[PDB]
Amino acid sequence: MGRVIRAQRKGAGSVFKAHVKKRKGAAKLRSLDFAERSGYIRGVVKDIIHDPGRGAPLAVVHFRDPYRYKIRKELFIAPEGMHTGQFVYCGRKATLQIGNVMPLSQMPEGTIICNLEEKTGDRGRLARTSGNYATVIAHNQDTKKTRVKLPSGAKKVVPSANRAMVGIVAGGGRIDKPILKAGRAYHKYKVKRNSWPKVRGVAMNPVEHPHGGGNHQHIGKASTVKRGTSAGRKVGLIAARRTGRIRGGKGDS
RNA sequence: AACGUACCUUGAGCAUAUAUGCUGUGACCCGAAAGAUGGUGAACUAUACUUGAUCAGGUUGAAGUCAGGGGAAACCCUGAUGGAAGACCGAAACAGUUCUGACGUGCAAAUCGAUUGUCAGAAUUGAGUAUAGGGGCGAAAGACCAAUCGAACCAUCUAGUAGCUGGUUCCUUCCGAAGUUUCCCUCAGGAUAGCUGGUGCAUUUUAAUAAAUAAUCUUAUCUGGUAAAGCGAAU
RNA sequence: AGAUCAAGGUUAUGAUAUAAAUGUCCCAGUGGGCCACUUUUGGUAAGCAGAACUGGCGCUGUGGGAUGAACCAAACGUAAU
RNA sequence: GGUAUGCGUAGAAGUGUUUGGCGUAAGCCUGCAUGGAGCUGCCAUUGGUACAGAUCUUGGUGGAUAGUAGCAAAUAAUCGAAUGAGAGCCUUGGAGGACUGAAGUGGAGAAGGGUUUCGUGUGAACAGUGGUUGAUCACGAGUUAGUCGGUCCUAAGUUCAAGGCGAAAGCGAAAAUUUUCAAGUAAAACAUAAUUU
RNA sequence: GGCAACAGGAACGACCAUAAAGAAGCCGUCGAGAGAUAUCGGAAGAGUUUUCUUUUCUGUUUUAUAGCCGUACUACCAUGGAAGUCUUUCGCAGAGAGAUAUGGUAGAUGGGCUAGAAGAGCAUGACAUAUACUGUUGUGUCGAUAUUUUCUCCUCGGACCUUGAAAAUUUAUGGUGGGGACACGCAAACUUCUCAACAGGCCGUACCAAUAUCCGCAGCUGGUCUCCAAGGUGAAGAGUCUCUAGUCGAUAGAAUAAUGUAGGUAAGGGAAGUCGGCAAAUUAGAUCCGUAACUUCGGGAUAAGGAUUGGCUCUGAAGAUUG
RNA sequence: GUCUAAUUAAAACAAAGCAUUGUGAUGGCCCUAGCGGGUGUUGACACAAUGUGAUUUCUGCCCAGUGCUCUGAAUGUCAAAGUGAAGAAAUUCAAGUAAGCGCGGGUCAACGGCGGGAGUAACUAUGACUCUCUUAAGGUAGCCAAAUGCCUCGUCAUCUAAUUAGUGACGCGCAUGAAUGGAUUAACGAGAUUCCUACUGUCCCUAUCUACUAUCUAGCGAAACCACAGCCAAGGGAACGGGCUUGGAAUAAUUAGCGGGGAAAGAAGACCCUUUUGAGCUUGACUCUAAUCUGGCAGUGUAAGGAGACAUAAGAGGUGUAG
RNA sequence: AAAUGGAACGUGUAUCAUGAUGCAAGCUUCUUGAUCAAAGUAUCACGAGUACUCAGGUAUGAUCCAAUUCAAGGACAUUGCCAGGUAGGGAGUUUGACUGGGGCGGUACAUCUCUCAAAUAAUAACGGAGGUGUCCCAAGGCCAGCUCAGUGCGGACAGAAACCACACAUAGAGCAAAAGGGCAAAUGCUGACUUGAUCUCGGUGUUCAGUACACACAGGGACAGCAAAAGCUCGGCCUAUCGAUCCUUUUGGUUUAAAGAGUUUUUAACAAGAGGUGUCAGAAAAGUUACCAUAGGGAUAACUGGCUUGUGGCGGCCAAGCGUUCAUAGCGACGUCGCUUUUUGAUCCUUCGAUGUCGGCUCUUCCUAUCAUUGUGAAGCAAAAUUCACCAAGCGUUGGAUUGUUCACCCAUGCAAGGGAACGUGAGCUGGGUUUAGACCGUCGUGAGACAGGUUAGUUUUACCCUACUAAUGACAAAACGUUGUUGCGACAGCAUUCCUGCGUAGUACGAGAGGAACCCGCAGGUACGGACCAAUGGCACAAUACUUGUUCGAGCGAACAGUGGUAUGACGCUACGUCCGUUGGAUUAUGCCUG
C-alpha cells in the first residue's frame, strides 16, 4: 500500500497545531459601533506588549464606552512611532495623523496605511505583518471605490467605507539578519508552528513520498504537478506558470 | 424415395439393501506467505504540548567601558578592567566507537570490563494530555508503535486452498502392470487410450458322463532401395 | 450380383492348443525411468545425452567374476536324496 | 437384537510367565501367581474398530551425569564463647583486621509493590551449599491529625448541553448558530437596571 | 499627627469601578544571614606512655509564634543650586526632568537582648540510693578566621526573530446614592481593636523504596523519579585514603598443570610484523619562554621546540582596626 | 547536532543560506463516512510545496519528447438533458455541442539531453585551419586514471634498499561537469587513504611472574543432543564409510587434554530454478476508484431593454400569339 | 445584533429680488486624570400627615417619521442527482510455456518438404538444408492446333548483339511460389470458348483416442460448361497456402414462437457462410524486489568429490634442416601417435527437512615429470664454468615494497631458491576482498530498480559425547600357575643431524696465455633444525628489603591500606640471547671393470 504522504498529515492537530499557549489575546481592529461611523473616539496606549509567535509588536490600548460604564481593552497592531501615552483616534471625523484609524473616504491618495479591512465590519484582515505597508493610490467617487496595492504588488479593488490604521507597521526587516545557526531557528519555530526543520524528498524512502528513494537519489519523475490532482499528491511546486531562474523583472501591472 | 436418429420392430421399470468408483461441503489426515469484518494498547519508543527538575571544577577573552603615549586631523598604540558565544579538556546525566577482547546451555531473549564523544543548549528529563491498524509517527532508517513493523497485536467467516511435502494401522491364498501416443497458459499434475484386475455370460466331434477356428514355418504370390556395389550413364 | 435346384472322397502345409469367445465397471494404478550387444545420431567427449528392434532392471530372490539392481547359469510352494 | 436349562465371591475382566498345546499366520485355548464384580462362544446386523512411523500431540524415563558441565565479577575474612541432636557461614553477641567513601553497599521521600514492617514459636519443601535466624510458613499484634495531604482553583485536553449530520453504534471535531439557552442582583412599577455567551 | 515620604490600637463597602498582588522562566553577580566546618582560649571528663609531648577527643546547644532595640541596603522627602564637572561600583549606572551634601521617611527580610527557659528541656560529668516509674551537685564562657565541598532575602547587568502560564481566593482606592449621626449624652459600632466560650467532618499513614519487597517467568551485575552530602591532598562534588553511619552478601577448606580469563616488566634492534600501527608504550599537572606554513584575520595554539618542578632553613612583597 | 534501539554512527540526515511556486479570503495547502474542523490568537518580511547546501567564486547552450500553465487568436473532434424531422409507436437521424486532448505560444535554480567525418603547416608529428554531414542545441568555465578510466599493474618524476598503492601533473574521458550543481576551500571529527617523528613482546622467539577458575575433595546438579553405534587401507557402490568381500588386525574399567574424523548439532535454503504460490513497490500494463475539474435539470424570484411582427389585428402586388 | 433611512427645524455659504434654491451643517484633537447610578425644566401627585414632616407622574432634557439588526453577494455559490473528461494519490490483479539450470538469444509453440531412418509404415533432441500467413478470371474448366533446354550451318546493317531458315534435338525445360515427384501430338507454347472456384445430400482418405476442425478423394441426385462424340470437369498437376462455442451479422421458408384473441413493427429462434481467436482446440494481461516473507525440488545450477580431457602443463617416434664441417653433442621443423588431473570448461550422478564457500598465518604429510647437494656417464667436456641423461626422495627450497591474493613483477641473501596432493585447514584463527540489511557515483530503464564495474561501514556461534592422538593409572582372570621383590633380555614399533665455509692442497696441475683445479684429503670453523642442562652473562622477580607520595595510627618503628601503590638492586629456581653436545656396520641399483 503506502502512506499518507508527509503533505497530507497536517490536519490532525497533535503534532501539528500552533503552540498558542503563550500567544497574547486575538489581536484585531476595533469594531464599527455608532461613533466611528458618526464621530470619533479617543483611546490611550498603556504598554507595548510582545507576541511570541509574531515578529511584529502588538499595541495595547483601551477606551471608554459610549454606552456602558467600564473601560474596554483592545489590541492593535503597532503603527510606527507609537510611543506609549499616545492619543489614538478612531473615526470618520478623526483627522489623519499616525497612527490613527480612519476610513478610506476621508484620506486622499498617496498616503500609506496598515491594518486594512476589505469587508466593512470584518475589522482589518489585510497587510499587517512586519515591514510592509498598506497603500492606496486610487480614489473613485463613482460607487464609492478605491483601488489599493497590497504588498504583493498585484493591485486590486476594495470598497471604501472600511477602516485602516495610517502608517507603516512595525517590525521590519527580519529577513536581513541571518539567523546563523541551528539553535535560533529552532526557537524561530519553537512557538510559531510545528513544521519540521524540514526534510527533503529525495531521501524519503520512495513509498512515503512521491519523489525520493532510488538507486541514486533523484526526483526522477518530473517536477511540475497538475492543477488539481488528488490531494495529496501535490508535493513539488504546485501549478507553476514559470519555473526556474528569473533573469529579470517580475512586478505586475 | 434419399439421409440423419438417445427411435419403436410387443413391452421392464420402480422399492430399497449392498460394493466399487467419479462428483459437490470438513471430502483421507495435520500444514502454509497472505485477503476480510470487528474491537485493541503510547506502561520502553517516535513525538510535540503542559507543567515540574537537574546537569561539579577548570583554560580561552566578545562588544562595551579605562587612562597612559604619539600626531596636523582621521586617530592609530601597549597596559588592564570586563565573562559574552549552539567555543574547549573533563564528573554524576546520558549516550554506545574500536578492541571485531571477557561469558555467547550468560549476568543477560543485549549485559559486564578497558577504551572514546558532547557536557550550559537542536541539551538532559518525573508526572499530566493529544495522536490509531492499511494508520500514528518519523532532524528520514521503511526506524519506532509494548521482546513483534515492507503492516502489527487478539476472536472469527477459518478443519480457509495446495498440481507441494510428511504419516495413510491385522494374517495368509490367487493374479500382477505402468513409465507411451494425442489434447491442455501443460512440461512436478489431469483427463485419454494403452496394460491390469474383477464380474459373469455364449459356444464349437477347435465344451463336458472335425469338413470350424484363432497363432509360427513351409508351399505359392506380391512387396521395398539398406548394405554390398556403381562411376569406362545421368546428378 | 442375388435367391434355388443338379454332381462332388477321405477338405486340402507343418506343429499345437497350458482352452477358445465376447459385452459392461472405463475398474485401482501409471503416464520421470535404466542397460548391454548389434544398428545409431548430437558432441573431441564421458558412468552424458538421443533413438529404432529386441531381451532384462524397476517388481527379483538368486547359485557364479571376493565384491556389485542388469554380467552368465536359473526365473524362488515345505521337505530328504 | 436373537441365542446356548452359558460359567461368576467354591474367584468373573485385564496383568505378569523358565507350566503345557493347537494355525500356514493373525490370533485362542490352558496351569500357576496377583486381583475383587462382572464377563465371553455360535448367527443375524454394524461404529469414533487393530499403529513402530507422521521435525506427530500428552504423561513418565534413559544414556552423557544422575553426579560430569560448572555455581570465578563487586579487595577478604578471622580465631574464642555460646547454644544447638549436629555450625567456615548465616544465628548470635567478645575481639578487631579491610571494604562502602558523603554525585556510599549510609538516613528518609516518590511510582509500583500489598502485610513483607514487629514479637512469639518453629519439621518438611523454600533460602541453585548447609541452617538453630530468615522477604517461607505456624501463631499473634501492629498504621491515630483542624495545621503533613488528597479535598478547592485552573493548565494543555478529553468533545462530555442538543443547532447538526449517520441505517443505527456513535462522531482520528477552535461544537463560538442553539425561546429566556444570563450566574443573577435585598429587587422598583409597567419583559428589577446598563449589565452575562 | 506631621512642610512632606508617611505615622498611630482600634473609627464607616451593601454594590459598582480601576489598580496591583495572587503570578515564575533561565543564566554570572557584589551586600548580609543561616546552619555545615575549621583553628584559638577558658572550661568538664575521656586518649596514650619504654621514651617525649602545657597534647590529638567528646561537649557546650535555645524551635515556631511574639515584643523591643532595629544596620546591611537600594529607592523617596525637605533643603540646596554643582564646570576647574561631580558622585559612585566587580562592572555602568547616575545627574538643572535636581547630582554631592544636611537631616528625615519607609521595606530588616537580617541580626542582637528579653519573653518562651522548672539549674526549661537537653547534654556533659559529678556524688549518694539493693536498686526500681529515684535522689541530689555542677556546667551551658568568649573572641575571631572562610566557603557555592550548600540554601537563603537584597542589589543591579546579561544572552534573545528564545520575552519567560493561567484562574480560585485577596487587599486598598474610586464612586453616586443610602445608612449612621442629638452634646449635659444612654451610646453604639458585619466593629479591619482588645478579649472569653464554641466545634472543624472525610480518608491516606506501619515497611522495602532496590547486587533480597519493582518490572525483568526468578532474591537475576541489567533500565528506575529526586532528597540531604563530611577529615585530608587538591583546581575540584576528581581520584586515591579515614571519621560518621553500615556491610563481609556473592559455595567451601585446599592445590601451583596446560590453555584461557584480566594487571605486568623483559638485554638487542625498533613495523620487518599484519588487511591496516589495532590491542598495547612514550606524552600528560602548573609556572617561564619559545611558536611554522594557511587563514573569512575570530585562528591553526596546548602547535611544535625546550628549560624548570622535592624536603628542609629564610628574607622580599599583597591588608584591617585604633591613626 | 542527529539516526538503524538487539551487527551498519559514517561520505546518509540536519541546518543556516540561496533561486523558484501556488494564495489577497467565495482564498492556497488539508483532514473530512458525512455536518464542520487544521493552516490561523492568523494575512506576502505570513502560509503551503519544494530542489539544494556555509561562504569565498561563477550559474554555460537547448522548448523537439513528455511533464506545465496560459490576459490563448481555435471547426477538426464532442456527452446527457434540452430543441428539430420522419415514423401508428418504442426508435431512426438532424441541428447541435461546453469543458478536455490535439491545435498556438511561454518556461529548464522542472525531470533530462549537450555527434562524428576526411583534408591540411620547406622533416616527421601535429591540426591554427578548410570542406561536408546532420540535430531541440552540440560537454561551455574548470577539474581527473578522481570515491567515478573497460583497456589497468595507464604514461612521467618523486616517497622507497625495491612500491598493483598515496601524492603530483598528462588528457579522446568505456560512462568527468555548472543549483539532477560545477572548480578552491580556513576551524572540528569514536572518518577513511600513505609515507616520517616518538615508539613498544606488534613481531624476529618466546621468557616468565601475581588476581580467581579449572583441576582434586564435602555438598550440591542440570542441558542441548543420541537408528543401534564406534580400529584404518584398497574394491564395489547412490561415485570423499562407522557395519559391507579380502586383508591389517583385537585384553577391562577409566581420569587428565585436544578438535583431525562422526559428511558432527543448529534453522524445514537467507542465495538459486520451482509451484498456473502471496506480500512490498513503479509508470509509457490491464479494468475501476475518493478528491477534483466541468454541462444540464432540480431547488428558483420580480422587473427592464434589445435580439427574434411567430401564431397573429390589417394592408397590396399579376402582360404567353388573342381579347 | 445601538443610533437604519427619510423629514423637520437648528447656523453658515452661494444664487434667487426679506424669500426660495442647493450645500455645509448640528458635537469630544493642542496634554498616561476622569465621567455610570438625573439634575434642570414643566405641569399634574398638585397630596398624605398637618404653616408644618414628606408625596409621584409623564414628557422635555435626550426631534419627528417608517420599519429588515448591520453591511456586503445575489437568482450565481453552496447542496440533490445524472452528463462526459482528466485521476498510480488509493484499491483488486495478473506478468505464460517450450530451455543441457535461468535469463538473455531462440521458433525448433500449430504447421510443409529433403534427409536424418537400419529397403512395410511408424519415430526422437534447441539435429541438417529449406519453405509457408500468399498468389490466379486465368495461372480456372476443356476441346483445338503446335512442341521446348540447347546446338550446328546460315543469312544487308549482324558480335554477347535482335530476326528468319534448316537439321540434331528424351526433356538437360516449362508447370505462380520452397524442395520432391510426375510431366513430350501433355499436365508446356499458342488459340477458341466458357464459368464446377455450383446447389445438394451422407460416406471415405491421412492427422489419432481410428474424435472434432481442416484438406484431398470416390460416389448418388441436380444444374450446367467446352468439345463432333466417347468423355473431362464438385478449383490451381499431387505433398503447405489454415479455427471451435459465445455473439455481431448477413443470406435465407416467404418460416413457425411471443402462452387469452387478432392486425402491424420489433426482437427471438432454425439453415449456409462471414466478423475472431498465429501462445494456432482459443484466458482480457507490463514491470521488479540487495527489506522480500513460503510450499517444496537435486525432476534444477553456484561450492565440494565423479567418470571425459577440445584446453593447457606432458613426453615418444621418423628425420627436413640447423649446429664452420658434422642430419641425431645438444637440437629437432613439416607431419606421425601417446599418458596425468594442478587449472580450464564440459556434464547434473549424490547433499536444497543446510557438507560453514575464497585467501594468507600455524602445521603434520606424502609426490615424482629433479632446482640444487651424494655416485656416474655424455658433449663442439682444456681448465674454470656450464649443458645432456640415467639412479636417487634423505635434510633442504628463504628475509621484504605495493596489493586482499595463487600467479605476476621487483630487492636481497644464496659458492645455489623446482613443481605438486585430498580446493589440504573457520567447534584453530583472521574476515582485507567477497556474496544481505546502511551510503554515495558514471551510464543504461520513464521508474521502485539491476550493473560477472568503483567505493567505505558490518554478531563469524557448542564440545563435557565416542573413537582417533599426545601424556595418566591399572584388575579379576588367563598362561610351561602363587602373593610380592629387585636385577635383567628384545620380539617388536619408531629413526635426525645438516650443508656450506676458509686455510692448506698451489697460482700448483692444467692452459699459448688469460685464467684457474678451494682437486683427493687433512685442518680449522660456520648454517638450520635436533637432544639437553645453568657455572658464569642475559632476561623475569624471596612483592625480602633501602630512598617514597596521600591518609589514619598523638608523636619514634614499619612498608599500615590504595584490589602489586610506583621506583632500584635482588639470591632459589625456570629460561634463551647463553652454554655443552649429535654416530657407525652390512648388502647391493646408476655404473665402470672381472673372466668367458
Q: How many strand segments?
A: 10
- H and E order: HEEEEEEEEEEH
Fraction of helical residues: under 10%
Shape: globular
Subcellular location: Cytoplasm
Pfam families: Ribosomal_L2 (PF00181), Ribosomal_L2_C (PF03947)
Protein name: Large ribosomal subunit protein uL2
Family: Belongs to the universal ribosomal protein uL2 family.
List keywords for this structure.
part of a larger assembly; 10 strands; 3% helix; RNA-binding; mainly beta; Specialised ribosome; 4-stranded antiparallel beta sheet; 253 residues; globular; 6-stranded antiparallel beta sheet; ribosome; 2 helices; 1 chains
Structural account:
- The PDB classes it as ribosome.
- The entry lists the keywords Specialised ribosome, Drosophila melanogaster, Testis, ribosome.
- The entry is titled "Drosophila melanogaster Testis polysome ribosome".
- The protein: 60S ribosomal protein L8.
- The protein is mostly beta strands and 253 residues long.
- The protein contains two helices and ten strands; from the N terminus they run αββββββββββα.
- The protein has helices at residues 35-38, 184-187; strands at 42-47, 58-64, 71-77, 87-89, 101-103, 112-114, 134-136, 145-149, 155-159, 163-166.
- It has a six-stranded antiparallel sheet, with no helix packed on it.
- The chain is globular.
- 19% of the residues are buried.
- It binds six RNA strands through helix 1, strand 1, strand 9 and helix 2.
Question: Could you provide a short overview of the structure?
Answer:
This protein has 253 residues and is mostly beta strands.
